[PDB]
Symmetry: C2
Subunit: 543 residues, 2 copies
């Protein structure tokens, strides 16, 4: 307790750990150092897009619900554009409690029309499947995949088209994550259809959340060390209990060695999701001691650190491609006016979340967030984000696999499914598109067994905590920022010092939603026993 | 919002309102005034007992569980005997997380032996009665009393002896409070037997909680005005919406009039529970524009303020008598060593809560709290608290009704039921007893109908909030301090700006406890369906 803290990794997970060390660990920023491997900001290794190239969204999937971790954290961060003592939480709830998020054209098909998404579209064996899924033990679902467990007809329901699009989830990936979602969002499973439970910032997560958080940390005195890629930790293992001795990093191409005392504590983001990303664009194409080194060397030391080869093994399985579109007005945005909750330029929500083309062989989705998306972007430009799931198949209009098809060609498949395939040439020159083909963007979703991921504090560790989407808590990793903050809090709390599924009202909210808003099995009975009792309100009304 | 606040009443409710105005209303102490009707502290109208007379506990029943309101409040109050930044919450959990509270001789009878209190002692129709009680609508239980609804055999169960003793509750009082208890403590209904869920301060609630809270408020600048008994408020009622214009008080025997602007806000504790208390003792006896004036005048103005005559109407119904015993060592404390969790002088918990003599015609209970009870009391003295329910009946040994029997005589009924009736003379001179016979100590428990109590903010009011145990929220009033803080928070929040029963695990925790720890009706079925599922842990094991 006159110790220092070392934080390996620049991200929401790392910054949140520093915050929790300051507020609730009662240590000072001067004893905190963040080890980053970025150059300095943005130049040749561009920071986060330029307004004259065409912008390039980090990559990828940044969606938020109203969880308690966010409220507890960003309640103490000074706002982005407001004076003291207004927080970023107050900005978040000001711009969003006025204009709530909900979708009008969530599912589309037949090259321009909306597929009815009022209900989840489950029959009866499908409902039984998820209920049977909810009842299975976690010990009995090792390596079982989505398509293995689920029926063939289930993967064509509204439910699966919505779920796989929302989380960018492949049919060959972990069943445990779908189960974990059920156990945690039964109350809100109706929201998968209208996007009610989703809530967005004014700008990005970076510009609206992390940028106020970094400013706050600098105003607290935390140390930053760029150009530092950590590849291993040397640790002692006496009495079956381990402590970190040194950080073996390579700084600016030369080995360094950072000494760690017994009192100090170390936080490390383990895996990567943006490793071998090829950044092609409109006319050229993508092509194809790393960030996985730290975890791989840790895996050699003991089994309590898991098997990273199970997540970075097959890069064709954990890969999909995004594309950032910068549009000056064209028939693409004219069509977009027809599918929007408001107007794109209004400043309010527009598409209300992603829009997924269901009969697209690519499983192609696209979103127009609350415009403007970036602080420095002009009023005659809109930033749309597009991405797809299947990298193996020919498009419906462009008979090219999407990893081989680039830029302009992506506009044709998109405009075909939008109902403006005859007006491609006009939108093609007016919209700047930059692509990102990420080979580990879903490596956390890969099939796994018990022990494959280490806990936030593995058994024995006294000064090392791991963060991110590759660590075993008791929760899902499908929400990227939420999971980063949760692990950060567990890490800081454990080394120092320190529900919804069982709710009867939620099981009724779930069962009715699973049965497409129609009265479910025991409901007619539950009304007759409860309509004249204290518990009348737990049931929804019948037609 | 450069307004002032007026707080009618000195108590936990009033102080908490001032706290919530400061922390979360963001106003300053200089604009807060508390209107009290005490002389100045303690002298002739003794403050809270002297160590040479025999002490006199406020009166009465001060018990606490681990609710969130306490944590949220006393987290910011500097501790009583610890340095900064240690709070009173930290004192509370330090002295109690080491020595947890639980009882060894909770129920006693046959003049010295313990009545088995492992289980609630419900048969099967009794269990059905409480379940049927839980299912009734609150609109259908107006004025219904305990003995009216419940069977005769139910009132002899372990359950009713425990419940009536814990809350000092008469068989002719409101059924709604027993129902409200069920809806809120199903998870913890087992705790009625062992006193697990109860948690006590080091000293009193006054010396350990309120005394740090008042010091905190004075260090914030809040104004106090003793000798001020408020009897009415003059209010305008335009547009069906009312505002307080003036506080009509009598200060030191002369009418005053305090002007209230449109921006200001007023908090008033409505009723009294210690009004006509006669303070007899060892050898003499009790005898028999008031605190009810403010509510009575308010009741004239509108129906939205309720019917106070329904609570202060029959003072024989809302009355019982307490007695504070100060003992230098005698055979009473020697016997007490046999019934204690630890030793009385140890400094730890002793009796673990009240001890109730079930075959006592008075329904006589007594407690020895964590000694010492007061800060200024010596090591060779113990403060015991005793009280009884039935004022109409002859004792088992002293054939006197207890309102007529005093001091020494109270020692005989107590020592008889303790098994030391032959050693009364020794304890009689060594123990100083002071009695309190309160005529409204349970006026809040009196039968009531919808509309009898006003809400924290009655419909229409814009600057007046009411506090205490006579206001309609959605919760019980059987916990005195908890209810005072809850109403205080509702009052401050509403005028400015701003679960457990439905838990499946809790219904199983309740059903097993109702059925005396033996497997209940559907349990054998619930095991067969759930033992090999995700939900195995929600059930308790079978023998």
């Amino acid at each position: 307790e006159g110790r220092k803290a070392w934080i390996i990794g620049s991200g929401i997970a790392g910054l949140a750990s520093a915050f929790y060390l300051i507020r609730d660990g009662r240590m000072k920023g001067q004893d905190i150092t963040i080890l980053d491997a970025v150059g300095t900001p943005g130049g040749s290794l561009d920071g986060s897009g330029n307004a004259e190239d065409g912008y390039l969204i980090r990559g990828g999937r940044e969606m938020n619900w109203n969880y308690d971790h966010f409220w507890d954290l960003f309640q103490d961060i000074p706002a982005l554009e407001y004076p003291s003592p207004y927080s970023v939480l107050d900005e978040y709830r000001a711009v969003n409690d006025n204009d709530p998020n909900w979708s009008k054209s969530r599912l589309m098909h037949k090259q321009g029309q909306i597929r009815d998404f009022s209900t989840l579209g489950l029959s009866s064996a499908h409902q039984w499947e998820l209920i049977k899924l909810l009842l299975k033990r976690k010990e009995d679902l090792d390596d079982i995949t989505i398509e293995q467990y689920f029926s063939d007809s289930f993967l064509e329901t509204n439910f699966w088209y919505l779920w796989r699009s929302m989380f960018a989830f492949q049919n060959w990936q972990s069943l445990l994550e779908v189960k974990l979602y059920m156990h945690r969002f039964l109350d809100a499973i109706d929201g998968l259809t209208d996007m009610s439970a989703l809530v967005f910032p004014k700008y990005n997560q970076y510009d609206s959340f992390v940028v106020p958080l970094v400013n706050y940390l600098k105003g607290q005195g935390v140390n930053v060390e760029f150009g530092t890629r950590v590849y291993d930790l040397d640790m002692t293992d006496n009495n079956g209990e381990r402590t970190v001795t040194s950080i073996l990093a390579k700084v600016d191409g030369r080995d360094q060695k950072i000494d760690i005392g017994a009192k100090d504590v170390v936080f490390a983001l383990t895996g990567s999701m943006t490793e071998g990303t090829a950044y092609g664009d409109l006319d050229t194409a993508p092509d194809l001691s790393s960030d996985w080194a730290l975890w791989q060397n840790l895996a050699k030391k003991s089994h309590v650190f898991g098997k990273p080869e199970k997540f970075c093994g097959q890069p064709s399985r954990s890969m999909w491609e995004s594309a950032t579109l910068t549009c000056k007005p064209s028939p693409l945005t004219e069509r977009l006016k027809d599918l929007s909750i408001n107007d794109p330029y209004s400043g309010k929500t527009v598409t209300g979340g992603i829009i997924t083309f269901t009969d697209s062989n690519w499983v192609l989705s696209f979103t127009c967030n609350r415009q403007p998306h970036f602080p420095t972007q002009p009023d005659d430009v809109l930033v749309l984000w597009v991405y797809a799931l299947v990298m193996d198949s020919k498009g419906n209009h462009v008979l090219k696999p999407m990893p081989e098809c680039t830029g302009r060609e992506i506009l044709a498949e998109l405009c075909y499914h939008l109902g403006i395939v005859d007006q491609v040439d006009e939108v093609a020159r007016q919209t700047k598109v930059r692509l990102a083909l990420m080979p580990f963007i879903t490596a956390q979703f890969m099939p796994r067994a018990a022990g494959d991921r280490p806990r936030v504090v593995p058994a024995g560790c006294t000064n090392l905590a791991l963060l991110g989407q590759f660590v075993e808590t008791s929760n899902d990793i499908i929400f990227t920022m939420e999971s980063s903050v949760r692990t950060a809090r567990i890490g800081v709390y454990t080394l120092l010092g320190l529900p919804t599924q069982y709710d009867v009202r939620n099981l009724i909210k779930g069962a009715r939603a699973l049965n497409n808003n129609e009265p479910f099995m025991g409901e007619r009975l539950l009304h007759r026993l409860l309509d004249n009792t204290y518990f009348a309100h737990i049931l929804p009304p019948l037609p």
